[PDB]
C-alpha cells in the first residue's frame, strides 16, 4: 500500500490530474510515453527500485504497478479441504488466552440506519454472510497439540443476531455491547445488534467481530456482502453473487507453504526473520514517556480515546506536504508521533509498532479477514535533523521495512527475545496508524445510512495514534498509565507538530 499510495503521487504529479484512483490506468487517464520516462524516473529516486516503462505496460495502474515492483499466488483449494489456522489467527487465540483483554480485540461496526431493519430478513442476511466467508464461522478450539480450526458447517453455524433496545444514550450501549467477551470454542466469531428506540431515529445496526476473523478493510466486504445479501433475502431469494475468489485458509495455506519454516535459511520466513534482528539489535527496554501512573504489574488492557479534530486545510496541507517529500500521509504522520516523543524525551531511537495490512494478492483484496501484520518502524532522531530530513529517514526505515513485512511480529519477538513485562507490549509500545473508512456506505439497506464510531473502553498498547479518514486523528491511551485529560493534551500536541511540520518542513526537531 506504500508503494500503491506513492504510484498514485507520481501519477497524480506527471499526468496533472486528481481523478488518480487505487484502479486507474495510467493510460486512460491521457498518459503516453515521455510521460513515462517522468513517471518511471521518479519512481526510482523515491521507492529505490528498479522500474522502467516495461513495468508500466504491465501493471499500467498504480494498484498493479505497485505489486509488480514487489511468492505464490492464492490458489483455491478444493471443496473438501480443511480449514488452517493462519498464524496471524494464532496470535489473535494466543493473547485472549495470557489475557483479560475485557473484549480489546473485539473490532466495531456500527451503521446508523433511517429505517428500523427487519431482524427476521436481517438474520438470514446474517447467515447468508457467515456461510459466504467461511472465516466467520470458523472456530478456535484448544487440543494437546495447540489451537485448532473448526469450521463450521452453514447448517451448524448458529448465528448470533438479536434486536436491543436502547435506554441511555446509544454510544456507550454500543461500547458495552461491542466489549462483551468471545468464546472462539462454540461461538462463531461474530455478532450482530440492531439497536432501536425512541431516542434512536430508525435504528443501529452493530456488527462485532472478533479480530480473529475481521480486520478495519474487512468493514467493506462485510456492508458491501450484507447490504447485497439482506436485500436479496428481503425478496425472498437468496442473494445473487458470483463466488469468492478465495477463502482464507487457501490464503493462509498459501501463505505458510510460502513463509517456510524458521529453521531452514533459504525460506523467507528465516531470511526476513534475520533482517529484523540485525534491525532491531540493542532496541530499548521502553521508552522513557510522560505517565501519569507506573505501569501496572497487570495488563488491565483498559484505555479511552482522545480524539483531535482535522481542520479540512490541514488535511490537505498534510498531503501537499507528503506529495512534495514522496511520501505517504503515513510516513508524516509517524514522523510527527516520533518527534513528540523525542520532543517529550524519549530519545533518539523511537520505535514505534504499525499495522501493514497483506492484502497485496486479488484474491483477498476485498475478503474477510485478518490481514494486519505489525511492524516496529525504528526512527533515529538523532543529528538534531529537520522534519524534511527525518521524512527521508522515516520513508528509508519504512520502505525497507516493509519488504520484510511477512515475518509474525511473534516469531521477530522470539528472535530479537527482548526483557518482557505481561505490562508492556514487546519492542514497542507507541502503535501509529492510517486508516480509512469505508466510502459508499450512506445508502445501505435501502436507507439512509451513515456509519458511527464506537467509544472504545479498552486499549492495545500503551499508546495508539491513528489517522483516520473519512480526517481526524484518534488517541487509543492506556487508561493504567495516562489520564484522559494528558492523553487529551498529547494529541493537540500532536496536531501543532503536524501545524509545524506543514509549514516549515526545514525546522530541527
Ligand atoms: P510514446 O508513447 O510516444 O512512446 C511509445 C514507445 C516508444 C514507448 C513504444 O510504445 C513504441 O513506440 N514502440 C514499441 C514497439 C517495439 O518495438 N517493441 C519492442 C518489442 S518487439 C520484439 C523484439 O524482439
Not at 472462539?184 to 435504528?203: F, H, K, N
Amino acid at each position: 500500500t506504500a508503494y500503491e499510495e506513492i504510484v498514485c503521487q507520481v501519477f497524480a504529479a506527471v499526468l496533472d490530474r486528481s481523478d488518480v484512483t487505487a484502479d486507474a490506468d495510467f493510460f486512460a487517464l491521457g498518459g503516453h510515453s515521455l510521460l513515462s520516462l517522468r513517471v518511471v524516473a521518479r519512481l526510482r529516486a523515491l521507492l529505490g527500485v528498479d522500474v522502467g516503462v516495461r513495468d508500466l505496460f504491465e501493471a499500467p495502474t498504480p494498484a498493479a504497478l505497485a505489486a509488480r515492483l514487489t511468492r505464490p499466488a492464492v490458489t483455491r483449494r478444493g471443496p473438501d479441504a480443511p480449514p488452517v489456522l493462519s498464524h496471524f489467527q494464532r496470535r489473535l487465540w494466543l493473547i485472549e488466552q495470557v489475557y483479560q483483554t475485557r473484549g480489546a480485540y473485539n473490532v466495531p461496526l456500527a451503521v446508523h440506519v433511517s429505517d428500523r431493519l427487519d431482524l427476521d430478513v436481517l438474520r438470514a442476511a446474517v447467515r447468508d454472510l457467515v456461510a459466504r466467508h467461511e472465516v466467520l464461522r470458523t472456530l478456535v478450539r484448544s487440543s494437546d497439540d495447540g489451537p485448532d480450526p473448526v469450521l463450521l458447517a452453514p447448517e451448524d453455524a448458529a448465528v448470533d443476531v438479536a434486536e436491543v433496545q436502547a435506554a441511555g444514550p446509544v454510544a456507550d450501549l454500543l461500547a458495552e455491547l461491542t466489549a462483551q467477551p468471545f468464546d472462539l470454542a462454540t461461538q462463531i466469531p461474530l455478532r450482530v445488534r440492531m439497536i432501536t428506540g425512541e431516542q434512536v431515529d430508525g435504528c443501529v445496526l452493530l456488527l462485532v467481530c472478533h479480530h480473529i476473523a475481521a480486520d478495519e478493510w474487512s468493514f467493506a466486504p462485510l456492508l458491501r456482502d450484507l447490504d447485497t445479501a439482506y436485500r436479496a433475502r428481503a425478496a425472498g431469494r437468496a442473494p445473487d453473487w458470483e463466488p469468492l475468489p478465495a477463502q482464507y485458509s487457501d490464503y493462509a495455506a498459501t501463505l505458510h507453504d510460502w513463509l517456510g519454516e524458521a529453521t531452514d535459511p533459504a525460506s523467507p520466513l528465516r531470511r526476513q526473520l534475520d533482517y529484523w534482528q540485525h534491525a532491531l539489535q540493542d532496541l530499548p527496554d521502553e521508552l522513557d514517556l510522560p505517565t501519569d501512573r507506573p505501569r501496572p504489574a497487570t495488563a488491565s488492557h483498559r484505555g479511552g480515546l482522545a480524539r483531535a479534530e482535522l481542520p479540512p486545510e490541514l488535511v490537505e496541507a498534510v498531503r501537499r506536504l507528503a506529495a512534495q517529500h514522496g511520501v505517504t500521509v503515513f510516513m508524516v504522520v509517524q514522523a510527527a508521533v516520533a518527534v513528540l516523543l523525542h520532543r517529550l524525551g524519549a530519545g533518539d531511537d523511537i520505535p514505534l509498532g504499525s499495522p501493514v495490512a497483506d492484502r497485496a494478492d486479488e484474491a483477498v483484496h476485498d475478503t474477510v479477514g485478518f490481514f494486519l501484520n505489525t511492524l516496529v518502524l525504528r526512527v533515529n532522531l538523532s543529528g538534531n535533523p529537520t522534519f524534511a530530513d527525518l521524512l527521508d529517514r522515516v520513508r528509508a526505515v519504512d520502505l525497507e521495512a516493509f519488504a520484510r513485512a511477512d515475518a509474525p511480529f511473534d516469531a521477530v519477538v522470539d528472535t530479537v527475545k527482548p526483557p518482557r513485562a505481561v505490562s508492556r507490549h514487546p519492542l514497542f509500545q507507541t502503535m501509529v496508524s492510517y486508516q480509512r473508512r469505508p466510502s459508499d456506505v450512506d445508502r445501505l439497506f435501502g436507507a439512509a445510512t451513515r456509519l458511527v464510531e464506537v467509544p472504545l473502553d479498552t486499549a492495545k498498547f500503551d499508546l495508539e495514534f491513528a489517522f483516520i479518514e473519512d480526517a481526524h486523528i484518534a488517541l487509543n491511551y492506556a487508561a493504567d498509565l495516562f489520564d484522559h485529560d494528558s492523553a487529551e493534551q498529547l494529541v493537540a500536541r500532536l496536531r501543532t507538530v503536524l501545524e509545524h511540520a506543514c509549514a516549515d518542513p526545514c525546522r530541527p526537531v
